[PDB]
């Protein structure tokens, strides 16, 4: 919930080495490591509201 804390909001492309605990229709409980290839998007990188 709250582990890391930094002064900067990383906008560059990155990933999250997250693992989920999902269950399929056959009830098969399996955990699975995810990446979430993400990146922040700003069309106008000067507007105070959007920024």
């Amino acid at each position: 919930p709250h582990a890391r804390r930094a002064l900067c909001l990383l906008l560059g492309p990155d990933f999250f080495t997250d693992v989920i605990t999902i269950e399929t229709a056959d009830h098969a409980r399996l955990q699975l490591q995810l990446a979430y290839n993400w990146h922040f998007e700003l069309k106008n990188r000067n507007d105070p509201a959007e920024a």
Binding site: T21, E23, A25, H27
Partner: protein, 92 residues
């Protein structure tokens, strides 16, 4: 100020969704509750018809304006050891 109407909004939201989810899963077999697990639990939270048919995409509480955008359920535990390695013979 209507935001602070309920002083325990976290508990209120959890209890209301839990109650309605439990009541709706109460009407379905275990086979159905596991085939359409997310489907029936998500229609349980905000049962209506605005999209069989999908209900909506908003679970609003008019008391304080608290809106549950979506409801996510992680894993069906069933705790007893007899649902356990007896459905495991079912596995075999």
């Amino acid at each position: 100020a209507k935001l602070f109407s309920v002083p325990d909004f976290v508990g209120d939201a959890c209890k209301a969704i839990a109650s309605r989810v439990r009541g709706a899963v109460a009407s379905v077999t275990f086979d159905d509750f596991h085939k359409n697990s997310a489907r029936i639990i998500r229609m349980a939270v905000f049962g209506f018809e605005m999209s069989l048919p999908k209900a909506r995409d908003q679970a609003v509480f008019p008391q304080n304006g608290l809106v549950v955008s979506s409801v996510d359920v992680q894993s069906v535990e069933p705790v007893d050891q007899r649902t356990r390695d007896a459905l495991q013979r079912s596995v075999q």
